[PDB]
Amino acid sequence: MNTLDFVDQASLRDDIPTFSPGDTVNVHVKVIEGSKERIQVFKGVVIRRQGGGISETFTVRKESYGVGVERTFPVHSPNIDHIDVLTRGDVRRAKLYYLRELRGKKAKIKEKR
Amino acid sequence: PKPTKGPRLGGSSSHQSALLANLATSLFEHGRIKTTEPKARALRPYAEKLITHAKKGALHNRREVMKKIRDKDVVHTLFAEIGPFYADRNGGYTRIIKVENRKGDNAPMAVIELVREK
Amino acid sequence: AVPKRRMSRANTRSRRAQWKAEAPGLVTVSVAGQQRKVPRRLLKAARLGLVDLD
Amino acid sequence: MIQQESRLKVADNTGAKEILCIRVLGGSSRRYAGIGDVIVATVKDAIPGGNVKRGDVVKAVVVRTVKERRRADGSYIKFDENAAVIIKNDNDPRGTRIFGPVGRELREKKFMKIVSLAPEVL
Amino acid sequence: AKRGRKKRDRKHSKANHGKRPNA
Amino acid sequence: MKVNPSVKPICDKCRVIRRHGRVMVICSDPRHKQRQG
Amino acid sequence: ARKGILGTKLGMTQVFDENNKVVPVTVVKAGPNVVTRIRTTERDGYSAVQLAYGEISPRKVIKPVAGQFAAAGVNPRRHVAELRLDDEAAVAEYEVGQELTAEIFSDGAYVDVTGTSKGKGFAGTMKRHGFRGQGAAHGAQAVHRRPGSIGGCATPGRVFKGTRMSGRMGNDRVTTQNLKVHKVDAENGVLLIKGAIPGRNGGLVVVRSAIKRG
RNA sequence: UCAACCAUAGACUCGGCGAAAUUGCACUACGAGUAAAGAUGCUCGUUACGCGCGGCAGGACGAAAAGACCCCGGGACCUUCA
RNA sequence: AUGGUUUGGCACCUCGAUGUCGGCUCGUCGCAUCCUGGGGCUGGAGCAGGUCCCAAGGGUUGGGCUGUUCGCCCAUUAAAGCGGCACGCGAGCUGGGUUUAGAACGUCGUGAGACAGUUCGGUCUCUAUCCGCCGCGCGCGUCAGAAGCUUGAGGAAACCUGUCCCUAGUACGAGAGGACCGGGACGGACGAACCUCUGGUAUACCAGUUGUCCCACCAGGGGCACGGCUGGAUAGCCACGUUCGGACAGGAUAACCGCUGAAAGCAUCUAAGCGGGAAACCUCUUCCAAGACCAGGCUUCUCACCCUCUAGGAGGGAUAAGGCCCCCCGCAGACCACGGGAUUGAUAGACCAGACCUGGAAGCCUAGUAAUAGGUGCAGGGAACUGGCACUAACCGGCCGAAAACUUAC
């Protein structure tokens, strides 16, 4: 419980799928380019799911054209059309910052079977 | 628990942990102990949480106690005739009683004791 | 640093008076029948018997 | 978060491999260059055969920052290298290609040619 | 300078009678 | 305007006056405008 | 006009606007305030409204305060405070016993929030006045955070009043100006105000209309 | 850049013991002046309820060391075709 | 002629000690204004300038070389001001230089040794008494004692500015080029508050893990090694973060533009009068503030007893309203103060639940020779955040604390 839960529950988004760090996802983020709303897919590994409630952020990492990229979205942001989980990851940590120094097969999360 | 805001009791976090362990050991061994007011104030949550572990009688709780106590006789006492004694009690296992100050340092003193009213 | 001059008696005493003691406020307690005076801080422990009343 | 004596990679094919910032433009005693912020730099490393050579003073635009930059939507964007594009005075690149992704802030800071040339604009 | 000027012009007073020490 | 301690006429049209405690010189030719200062 | 109200700060949070842009807000429990006295020029020399806020037991009230609230004709509250106005035409709206809620404001209004800053205790000149300290190396003998010079020399021979020195920071009245209310919530009786508010959570504040921006 | 945080020893508070350099005095303000030419102490004004605690170090030309630089006087040691 | 910042002259305080250059920190002042602001003249078409006047509110970058100040240079900038304050500031720092003792080069000197010549190296002491300054309390006073809310004399703070767009490629101009005025957006720097985000930190959080010792042993754990190290990390503190701010408007003015107008039949911004006019000034914004000794104001509460002196003026006691101390506490805090609470109670702790952090406990089972893995099981552990619960502790309580009247008017 918190003291502002009654304020946050309004903006609290349903349809947020249950995911966790290590889980690979596709975030369909709304992108505006000069009076033109489209959707960009940030496909990447969740390294982090900080926070609670409306303030909850999740950080998704990918390697685009030979460069690491991380997007820290709010979980209940309405700029996110949806989040499509693809693979769940077997990780022994809650925050996969060690991927920031790993490029390639070293940065391949163990899929959950 | 709510950690020590200020400087720790024994000039070190280590010596604070050791103090609290030894003082809880003594408190469960003897029922009451006289020490300084701050040491008692800090011990009361420590000891009450160990007693909570003792009320929740199970091996996990016994080991979570033994990682602080290290006196097996006191651990047994906790899990045999303290925890059960306080099964009906929802907290409030200890009371602090302010007493006369020392002479050599005028240190405020307090007797921290276990309650025995039920 | 050091004091430039001998402080006068007036000023010396003016602050030396501030080095005093606040006397403790006492209350009555009826342990062992007799009415003794203790601090309210120690009232409980005196009712119990943890207060050396000389 | 880029400042004087900060070394950046070059996300283009001018011949420069890395540069060193001198000034962040935007005002007086400007400290930090985020994405879309123009800088004055010098080429510290360059490929052997290149248009711009070692020691050439140039303008550049920052397109990747390690330090996460907020966005109005509450999101953030963070890369693993600080990288920039060398430009002319028309805010157009001196090179003809752009390596790696760039931030979307370039679109609002009017570096549309770089936005177009880049493979991914995030 | 101002200080010397003022101190000298002080001598132009009914009491000093146009003379003062160090003028 | 010229601001100098020596303000004086420059031509026959330049007239001298005392305005607001200041000696001014006025003229059709505004080049010849002057003020004491 | 400069309509206002007393409330309590509850904490900060996020919301999202129509553009999906994030708004850091502070939730202010702009609560049921009750008018307890009207200040007039014919009586007090100035135009103002005395408001009262905060539930309180009628036994924790000091009896003078009880008598004040009684002669007003209301039940006591914890905090009392005046809102200065500009004229009798502005004070004529407030009647004693009148109840003020968050609904006096409206979404998009600009407010000034007066609160009591958090206490930073006895602070050094760095934390208190943004002094650069001195070097942490290169010979510095024990001046790594010390203010350095304090005045001139003999010619001044003194330290000027108002010099910036170490001391207690915080617990000072702070008016943050031109905060845009993101939302009113009369059901809960609160205001979502874009951005920081002075004080701790649970701290009393005064949300007034912005004296600059309407 | 540009500093933030944590602990510890001090500093702070309580108890106990208990110094020091210094000291012409004293109920030791500020300005502009004046003055052995840089004033707490004088003049004209301004300001200031009395007493403490923690702090800072601009002044008390602060303490310390009868300035080592300079000069005068005297020594000492050194040099040399004195 | 100013000024007194340069080199100097004098040698007036200081040689029973006034520490020196430069830098760092902290500033403060002047304006002889670098920018911003206002304006006159122009050989001012416009952009941009030049020159002069008013203006000191704010701002006036970071680097390379050098001990350096200065200067040159690099990039920038709206601008990269000039000076004073013991060439501000060493009981605030440095100590690279100068300016001890060592050594060396060059030169001088027979030599010892010397050099506003160079070179390498080379102890920066002091517990703050007074003033002052920053903050915080105690006492008394403000004609009874108290309480709440306040006024605002008087002070403090803040005061910066660019780029782009439209106006308009219009005015102007052969063109090149290119506006004033006025609107709009986005910014830099500075500052305040805040911690929802991000990010840092986390010495009683979680996990892993090395070495070693111990809990008899396995298992599980603990002590120590910078919290042993690592990986993460809620609160709080905080900035790199968030938000906000500088205003608008008015008055009076400077330079300046003027009107009506004489003296002086004209003319004249002035002598009587009337106006306009700047980031300066006063107002405005924020903050402190009635010790504002004219010690304020609006209200509310108590608004009542005894004793002794010989009842004169007092003194002592007990009280009320109320407050203090003790007590539980705080995101309040050096102490003190402040704030809250105090059994007619959720103030703290415990407990319960949640949130959050960690990330899947122990035990048992299963698979595997084993290392280990999987299930039981968003497990277990756990601090600050929230909410519930009087279980513990806020006590069977002590100390302070209230009225001479008089005069006049109504």
UniProtKB/Swiss-Prot annotation, chain A:
An example Gene Ontology biological process: translation
Coiled-coil boundaries: none
UniProt GO MF annotations: structural constituent of ribosome
GO cellular component: cytosolic large ribosomal subunit
Domain of life according to the entry: Bacteria
Keyword Ribosomal protein among record annotations: yes
A Pfam family per the record: Ribosomal_L19
InterPro entries given in the database record: Ribosomal_bL19, Ribosomal_bL19_CS, Ribosomal_bL19_sf, Translation_prot_SH3-like_sf
Keywords, in A-Z order: Ribonucleoprotein, Ribosomal protein
Similarity field: Belongs to the bacterial ribosomal protein bL19 family.
Known function: This protein is located at the 30S-50S ribosomal subunit interface and may play a role in the structure and function of the aminoacyl-tRNA binding site.
Listed name of the protein: Large ribosomal subunit protein bL19
Swiss-Prot record, chain C:
GO terms classed as biological process: translation
Domain of life: Bacteria
Keyword vocabulary terms for this entry: Ribonucleoprotein, Ribosomal protein
Residues in the signal sequence: none
Entry-linked InterPro entries: Ribosomal_bL32, Ribosomal_zn-bd
Region (Disordered): 1-19
Bridged cysteine pairs (disulfide): none
Cellular component terms per the entry's GO annotation: large ribosomal subunit
Gene Ontology molecular functions: structural constituent of ribosome
Keyword check for Transit peptide: no
Biased composition (Basic residues): 1-18
Pfam families (alphabetical): Ribosomal_L32p
Similarity comment: Belongs to the bacterial ribosomal protein bL32 family.
Annotated protein name in UniProt: Large ribosomal subunit protein bL32
Organism: Mycolicibacterium smegmatis (strain ATCC 700084 / mc(2)155)
Swiss-Prot record, chain D:
Pfam family, one: Ribosomal_L14
GO cellular component: cytosolic large ribosomal subunit
InterPro entries, A to Z: Ribosomal_uL14, Ribosomal_uL14_bac-type, Ribosomal_uL14_CS, Ribosomal_uL14_sf
Domain of life where this protein originates: Bacteria
GO molecular function: large ribosomal subunit rRNA binding; structural constituent of ribosome
Family label: Belongs to the universal ribosomal protein uL14 family.
Record's subunit section: Part of the 50S ribosomal subunit. Forms a cluster with proteins L3 and L19. In the 70S ribosome, L14 and L19 interact and together make contacts with the 16S rRNA in bridges B5 and B8.
UniProt cross-references to NCBIfam families, sorted A to Z: rplN_bact
UniProt protein name: Large ribosomal subunit protein uL14
Organism, as annotated: Mycolicibacterium smegmatis (strain ATCC 700084 / mc(2)155) (Mycobacterium smegmatis)
Lineage of the organism: Bacteria, Bacillati, Actinomycetota, Actinomycetes, Mycobacteriales
Name of the encoding gene: rplN
From Swiss-Prot, chain F:
Domain of life the protein comes from: Bacteria
Gene: rpmJ
NCBIfam families associated with the record: rpmJ_bact (TIGR01022)
HAMAP family per record: Ribosomal_bL36 (MF_00251)
Family: Belongs to the bacterial ribosomal protein bL36 family.
GO cellular component, one term: ribonucleoprotein complex
SUPFAM superfamilies linked to this entry: Ribosomal protein L36
Name of a matching Pfam family: Ribosomal_L36
GO biological process: translation
This protein's UniProt keywords: Ribonucleoprotein, Ribosomal protein
InterPro entries found in the cross-reference section: Ribosomal_bL36, Ribosomal_bL36_sp
GO MF annotation terms: structural constituent of ribosome
Statement: the UniProt record of this protein carries the keyword Ribosomal protein: yes
Entry protein name: Large ribosomal subunit protein bL36
